[PDB]
Symmetry: D2
Subunit: 425 residues, 4 copies
């Protein structure tokens, strides 16, 4: 029952392919606190990878889950239905941006959600190709690995992933890719490899997660929407990570000024329970013939009641406003730290989807991956759990539960401050 | 709060692609009993589609789940580990057949397990192709739909699924496909479309589920194993449905006299909680580099403890012996009904994976899909939940919990018997 | 000079990937005779691989070529047209079977012809998949290698060829594949891997060439034509080898009682000059937008006049009739030899597309690849050029020019007769 | 017998997909002169699309062709060899750039050459993927259409072409793509879609043909070579159009300062006869096992002696030097015309591979496709045959025979001048 001991057993029974960011075995948790098997307490700034916007075991969520456990945990919706699945669908049809009739499909994981959105876009348009962006992340199934703009390590050593997935450039001025370059990269696909008539959908993260927490501007998103409309291409917004309130609105697309045809959600939607889904223009969703959509565990009963509670908690605890306030506080603190450390070349984020990006001597073409990894390690040593990301591994992101305590905001920022001070020594 | 009312709401909020076998909304359940929103009771012979071998809400399983709910529900193993994931892996490494050391990856859905078994086989052999069988069912992601030997409705209207998946014939003498034809169909692939050096794996269900409950014979499975050994090809046993004790042994491969290189499992492994996995040769599992395997919800903590308890219950309540006793009582009972109804052309099954196949006037060339569906509808009217399957929709399968009580076995057979009799006028 | 000296230079300047059936360098040839650089004379029973139905350098063909050579050899039709191309197309439109308007595309090689026929079927049906048959041979480009039903050596060591080509079984009672098995295999594809709505074409050789000189029966071709009509699938007859008179009619489909949608031709169409083409249902051919069809050397002027001259020669010289007479004499002569040599298990062929298949001890399950190779070697030492074929390399085919004299037919059979006698001594 | 009547017959016998740049039917030609069926004479600045660098029917080439026509026209090299094939291979092994042992394969068309070079590279590296550049042109087979950086019209309406072909950006400063952008676009592929370990080759035209006569700089080519060397990727130089002396040297790579691993050649290699081939590092070429390379008409006897004669003519008549002189006279004359017409935004070219690009009011952002088309039509009315190209159809290219007479160069330039003036009036 020591972390080391458990890691030894892990090497024996579990594949090295399953990475381990922190060699620690968590035992119990509560809101933003996690205790490992040795009793040490940590402040969780990773949030189970953006899955815990309402924190570990939110009391209301757990209470709803415990009540559902008295009724049933599974029937397989496609065989025998149940109300929690229906209710969530009804609520998502209203909450997802788009001033038009929508329908919702529930599945189990974010990769399944993206898979289903594409199968739906293909059926609706009678086309087979898709376009995804550089640095994108959409899942670990063969097809979402192809959609994912990163081979190593997600699909490394496995041979080539499915074809007919084309690569566009994600707008990112910080790294010299203008919105014009991004829109131009799409037309390039049209002229060089796949005409519009063969593209069923363009998949994009309103705010890239693993890609580096880079956000699309409303203007860029508006150009994209116009491009899709012109060519009858479905716009799929993958909000698995940006969704469930992380950016200050339930869905980031609300802040773009345009609505997508399809939206994928997961992670924080059920606050720590396995659930995912796709909500979209009704006519598009209905394109698949009966029997064409499913999944054994899809819209698991317990996960659904959990999601329903999460939605009510956002409303009751005013978490969207808190997300925004937390974001301002984190960025202000991060900018203060930045004044003493030029390596921090950018502080950014919508709502609580905050990140800082490190550069050697603030040199924007020199991603500082060693410092980023060093800060993560030093933070773990000070009891703070962090995650990094970015195609060059030089981005630190903050995904702490929105339910965080005032004291914990100070605590996390203080610990980060120390890490940069002690790394520079 | 009426089934019809909820069905109307379903039709407006959920896409038609999500099918519905029984237009009923379950409210609560216990072991083999299910109650709908109207208070009507049903005997569940579908088991959430082979997910409830230990019954709805087995008390031991629920108690384990409730204890974990007091600790944590999610951290994302790849970020912070936890003991329930590690303990289940160790047990699965022991329980899945094979005299070599195994390693286990836990994910969430059956589709993901198959996806990962193939990725792992590709990384291990450094090959990209795979072979799957006619009538096979492996999931609803783009790649598993390609593996699935059934286009309609699973991938209907969507265009061609991922290439480089070759089709072999599942052995099935009842319908003229000999074991020699089956093996010859694999050599044909080697000769005509993809040499052995390009085939990473051959995926097979030891007992096809959706395909019609057709079982491979040990002899066949041994020829398959030998063919794979000869070519360095990974044998992937998809036991998502056949697994977790349905055939009288924990895994069907135990009755085949050979061990596969990789085994996928899900559905009944956690008795009603979202979990799936892949267990196989340790050096094959480790072929994928760190960071190449995962998934946000993978090995969800609550589902892991649920699974550990399910395995304990199989042992304490002697469910494997019960599966075999249940299977015999069911087959004896159906063979009885078959005496008065020639349409019942075959009664079969390993352990409790039982099925009957209907033919118009016992003519094996005339699948009776109409009678099949009628029996399903009549049974529901009598309070019995059934599922059919098979490429010709003329197979009735029984997936009732292995924890069913003796009187319920009689009750169910009695209802089935009544359905056939009444179907005669 | 010396054949061996040239072979030595060959090994140093040319990749070993280019096979050499006969280690002999030809210097001159005429009709059915070939003389090597050592002055040795050979009776050519291979016909440049079915390219010389009108014999080496037919005087009429040569005179037409010389006349054209004084005018121009190339302009690239797509840039500046020329009459010989136009004229050939008009004649092929009327001569290729099909009681409906047709258009003809001229390219250069047989592989290009097949490539374009599939491209045209895809544009006409707006579908991307194709079906080809076991043991088929369609060319050496990436896509035709996928269509080709034989991986080694055509595409050995190169990794997997293009996907979305599905495999059906070619009817062959001799080796246990009935017509019902063949058609069932097509429906199997529709059920398991690609719905009819995703198949642009079914490609078939009315008489397989490399596959072993196995011919389709009119009854089978008719079931196949009806299956295509029912699903809107284009039937492509690849007559690159069976065409230009080899079977007794200009095209083998003529003897099938049904017409294909598209026909590819090459080899013998130009009597020894580079030319290939696609003739088919006009509205299908016109489905491709201008600029979509071409090739720099396409419908080479010199090869076009040679082809026009070849058609006239078939008429003026009664070659179709002669092909039938030649085929009968060859089969009668081969059957006489078969009375003394049990290894000859089958003597078959339409028109002059004649082959015999060798089996060890006359057992249809024991192909005798060694004996076949031995006969080719012995025949060569006796001044007779032969080619073998078949997936088991135990089929000897006869592709001698249709212009052969009676004495040479007798002579060819005697030589063959002696090779069998001396192979058994 | 008028161009009009022949164009009408054409509309009825030939598919519309076969485009027709000039609605004229040629009857005969000599060097750079062409006469149509109406007896009108034209000055050919298109060279049969870069195929006639030694002019129409060069008397030395014709005499070589006539000598061979008396011996044999076809045997199928892979069946029975002949010396003309072997001798050209030996010469190309020496002529193709690269200070190391090489081997040569002869096929028939440029697309078949690219096809085989890729197959060879895949076999040599044991990798399945390839990278090609934007605006590239490599042929009309399925795979070369995927390699081709232009969907319309080459593969328009045919569905998606073969996957696993990735797109890099060709360096073109005139349009804003720096060499750094080009090289970075390759690393982007490695990072986002296909690791170097899965890329067998990078295919590039030293000077893009259809692409717009845009040439790679030695610096860029050297960077590409260093990149390929680092990753074990084969650099395939497609010189089908740039080769056979068009750029001032036999092969353009000679001017790049580095040698490709494989080179494709066709068009002008045989002065108007169907031939093409691939020459490469011996060890790379030998990677394919015997029987893996071929083609019925491959290295046709008559085209081989024509290519041999073409190479002698280049040496004897110093056509490489003339290419350079012609190039200079063309640019000087075109530059002169550019002063009176600002629409000519660029005059460029290595050797005799000359082009000018038209912009709407010198605005490089406004490709003048309409003026380009007008000039072609006016030139034709004036007796001069020209061809345009470029992704935006605003590039006029000159592929006039290198054997052109001085007065004709002036004649041609004068006509182009009048076209621009009159188009402006
Ligand atoms: C944008 C995005 N899309 C899809 C997924 C896949 O979700 P899951 O891991 O739940 O399958 C993730 C998870 N990291 C994600 O961030
Ligand atoms: C053999 C088999 N494989 C894979 C799957 C897919 O599992 P899931 O629905 O959990 O994704 C199923 C589900 N019916 C199955 O029976
Ligand atoms: C039926 C068939 N189709 C296509 C081809 C390819 O023709 P080519 O070699 O002229 O490219 C051949 C050549 N053996 C053939 O026999
Ligand atoms: C660079 C290049 N590569 C390949 C080809 C194809 O050659 P072919 O038309 O002879 O098949 C062309 C033809 N314009 C070409 O320009």
């Amino acid at each position: 029952n020591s972390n080391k001991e458990l890691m030894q057993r892990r090497s024996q029974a579990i594949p090295r392919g399953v990475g381990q960011i922190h060699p620690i075995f968590a035992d119990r948790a509560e809101n933003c606190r996690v205790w490992d098997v040795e009793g040490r307490e940590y402040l969780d700034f990773a949030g189970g990878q953006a899955v815990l916007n309402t924190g570990h075991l939110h009391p209301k969520v757990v209470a709803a889950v415990e009540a559902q456990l008295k009724k049933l945990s599974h029937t397989c919706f496609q065989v025998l239905a149940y109300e929690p699945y229906l209710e969530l669908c009804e609520i998502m049809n209203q909450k997802v941006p788009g001033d038009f009739a929508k329908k919702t499909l529930l599945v189990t994981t974010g990769s399944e959600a993206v898979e289903n959105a594409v199968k739906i876009a293909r059926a609706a348009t009678k086309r087979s190709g898709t376009i995804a962006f550089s640095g994108a992340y959409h899942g670990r199934t063969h097809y979402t690995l192809a959609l994912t703009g990163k081979v190593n390590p997600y699909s490394a050593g496995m041979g080539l992933m499915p074809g007919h997935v084309y690569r566009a450039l994600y707008p990112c001025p910080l790294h010299g890719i203008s919105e014009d370059d991004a829109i131009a990269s799409i037309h390039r696909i049209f002229k060089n490899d796949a005409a519009p008539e063969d593209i069923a959908a363009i998949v994009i993260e309103p705010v890239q997660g693993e890609g580096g927490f880079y956000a699309s501007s409303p203007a860029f998103m508006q150009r994209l929407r116009a491009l899709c409309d012109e060519h009858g291409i479905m716009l799929i917004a993958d909000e698995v990570q940006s969704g469930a309130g992380r950016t200050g609105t339930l869905f980031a697309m609300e802040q773009m000024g345009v609505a997508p045809d399809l939206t994928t959600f997961a992670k924080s939607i059920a606050g720590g329970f396995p659930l995912a889904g796709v909500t979209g223009r009704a006519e598009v969703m209905d394109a698949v013939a009966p029997g064409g959509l499913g999944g054994t565990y899809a819209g698991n009963p317990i996960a659904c009641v959990a999601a329903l509670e999460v939605l009510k908690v956002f409303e009751q605890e005013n978490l969207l406003q808190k997300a925004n306030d937390l974001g301002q506080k984190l960025k202000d603190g991060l900018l203060a730290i930045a004044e003493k450390h030029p390596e921090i070349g950018d502080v950014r984020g919508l709502g609580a989807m905050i990140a800082i990006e490190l550069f050697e001597d603030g040199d924007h073409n020199k991603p500082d991956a060693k410092l980023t990894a060093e800060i993560v390690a030093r933070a773990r040593d000070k009891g703070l759990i962090l995650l990094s990301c970015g195609p060059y591994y030089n981005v630190l992101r903050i995904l702490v539960p929105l339910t965080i305590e005032d004291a914990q905001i100070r605590q996390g920022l203080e610990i980060i401050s120390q890490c940069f001070d002690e790394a520079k020594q």
